[PDB]
């Protein structure tokens, strides 16, 4: 009907009768500044004709803290400014991406473009027919939205939140097969920028803790989860604000591992426990994004490595709770800056970088790899970094903390990647998978199995085993953590298809390991295959069955005459020095009773000369219960029995 | 009691004359007990000279000899505002004039005679009495000297003594 | 000249105004009350214009004050300095109306003189 025809006046007088003062609001100033249809929603949502009997009952349902616990202030600065020896770049629509120095992101970039890419989606929050409509006026914010749902089709719990550059909201709505529409809300951010409350509550009554910048509000009813009302929020506010950025990303990590320790990932009973972890995760994103706004320019290296910390927390939660969803961020600026910083890093020039520089490079590949953009110059570069890491591994047969973190960053890159187009690149990637299998020895199995059996002190940044990228399958033993199987499944799902896997009748439950040698693939399984030759283990008591089926990637057959399935024996080991005949071959060790022990791929001549050592999985002299098979590129299998 | 004029029983349909035009009395529709209750009022108590008049409609006399005026109204105190009773009062005058034909929009504030100053006793209600009536009809006017008064109901009637009873049971 | 006062600062919230509430663009004045006078209940009053008739509607002071708080907070930098004093008043007038505020000061029918 009428939109402006209802008011011909100019002011909106507000008379204070018993003080003699009056305020005014210009009607035009309210129409072309606040959206005209948004004012009518603000008026209808207010419910100004609501009887005071109801508003009192609303305050009698909420839970108010005793008093605010305001603390010294300013917490820990979630900041990383470009260093004093800076090189800043005021980037605009000029598209000067070819004029950026180096390949490690040691330069600066404006924060207004980074924040514009973090919060790049309008979300109509606090709308009607939602449990947030009772406490918050409807608002439209540009921010990132998080959401989790756990429960059956009868009863459920809805965890969903939003991370803005001024505040973060989380909700604990109760989805039951009846009507109980009372949710628990947690707030964090600038006190003067928090979403405006309804008429029956104020922030001074509900703020639990405050520092010089941020506050902590919790709008929860008196009949909410008992673990929420009897919770020390002042302690949570301190561990979030005064902790270093790395302490926060590791404390939240141990929380998710503790939730995974018990079978509470999909249990709606421990919903407030997840609700608190989701709140801490959303604060971690807020503090990082907030610290970016506190500077004119930011360093590309820090932001790309701070994103990787948050991206690891989001992907480690999605494995525990598959309904975990994050929407809203479109990193188009940093995605374009790293596109030029990576093009300078050749495959041969990537393995030359040290551990820290390789971390910076791989931290930038993740921005393009989360959809999958890995160029061939990096995939071949990862092949050399692992090859150098594997050749040096054969000296000590141990992996340090700095090496396991590298394999974790490589894991978060190859798992999030489309299969390579060039067939020559795919063959070099299968060599790395066969190399991680080589470092996945029997010593490493029990090492990571026992390490993943202690979820209290579990640190995946320091507990990542090379088996999670290997092609070995007998990792399951058959309250312990399950991320060992979840991280490995991420690599087995997004795995480049084995070339000879489509030539037989393979059943992927009776499979121990897959060895994709060049133009031949051995399959250690429990049942023989149908395509090509099969080698059977002659052990009497094996507690299992071992059949080494050798397939050709072209579904073809071999030229040598296969009469039976007996494995010949060559005795005299001579530590081959005559031009590496063990090259492109895999030596196999198996216990004559407890199945396999270890596989090792021999690529370099140094790896060869290192297999004949103590503290190695092969060629132990007195230990006769373990045999040593030689799976070679011949397509033939032979047993190595020299000293013994 | 034969009621000649009742304002509350009309239901907002009865409109009166407000002199002058800009300021003065205004018909206001308030809702009390889930039912609309109309009223004339004015609360211009911070200015100086204000002869705010409010003339009623034509009331046919018929047989009215002595009329009684009932006034249902509310008055707001003066010490509530920070004014210290500069031009704020708690009373208002009541006038009355006669006419044989409905003047309509004509209102001369010289033919009216001041009856009495209406003082409060907070629904302050007082009743007046004047007479006798001579012409075929009459008007009624309310004057505000600068008070904050909300006039809700006005009742005009004359009292009739019923038939006397004979002691022999007729 | 200045603030023009209203005859009845008090009113009573009827359970019919929710059905016949005037929209925002029809309210003439927003006359408030005091935490000491008008029985100390949080109550506001709106004025309208329905055919040359000044329609007065009783309105919850809590919800109406929080409404104006959101209107000024929506302005942000475009808000005037006098608008910030409007937000200043509503900030302490709400926290002063919320203190106490038991079922005694929630009975709005005290001022329902009918
Ligand atoms: C309440 O009103 C006072 C002033 O009232 C003034 O005096 C009355 C008689 C009436 O004429 C009003 O219209 C006047 O505005 C406000 O305060 C004063 O503000 C001036 C600056 O403008 C300052 O110098 C004085 O110290 C103030 N006086 C006091 C007592 O504080 C006051 O702000 C009003 N209250 C609110 C909440 O708005
Ligand atoms: C980065 O460069 C831009 C422009 O290249 C700067 O922005 C504007 O410059 C014009 C001058 O033509 C001024 O009128 C505007 O006020 C500037 N905008 C702002 C927001 O200041 C911008 O200031 C530069 N950034 C820094 C940190 O120096
Ligand atoms: C809730 O946690 C807080 C820590 O944030 C506990 O308090 C502190 O206690 C020390 C005494 O050892 C005081 O010096 C600090 O000032 C307290 N913290 C603050 C923020 O003031 C508090 O005791 C805990 N409460 C409960 C019930 O467990
Ligand atoms: C609105 O207020 C200003 C002063 O703040 C006043 O000059 C103006 O006349 C008012 N508008 C109307 C329509 O009276
Ligand atoms: C949600 O439902 C659970 C299970 O019925 C209950 O324990 C909890 O108190 C409910 N929370 C709220 C806020 O209603
Ligand atoms: C936060 O809590 C974790 C355990 O939950 C603890 O290891 C860490 O030291 C705490 N941080 C601070 C700053 O208290
Ligand atoms: C991100 O923004 C670019 C514009 O630079 C657009 O082309 C692209 O589709 C956006 N991505 C998403 C997921 O919306
Ligand atoms: C293949 O088998 C022959 C024996 O017929 C052996 O001499 C040769 O070394 C084997 N190939 C490799 C790569 O070891
Ligand atoms: C509760 O109501 C009584 C009225 O009987 C009042 O005197 C008292 O002040 C109220 N409580 C508070 C905390 O104001």
Residue numbers in the entry:
A (entry chain B): 36 to 513, 533 to 698
B (entry chain A): 28 to 148, 162 to 210
C (entry chain C): 17 to 130
Sentences from the paper on this structure:
However, the receptor for EBV entry into the epithelial cells remained unknown until recently, when the ephrin receptor tyrosine kinase A2 (EphA2) was shown to bind to gHgL independent of gp42. Similar to EBV gHgL, KSHV gHgL also binds to EphA2, to enter endothelial cells. Here we report the crystal structures of EphA2 LBD bound to KSHV gHgL and EphA2 LBD bound to EBV gHgL. The overall structure of KSHV gHgL is similar to that of EBV gHgL. Both KSHV gHgL and EBV gHgL bind the channel and peripheral regions of LBD of EphA2 mainly via gL.
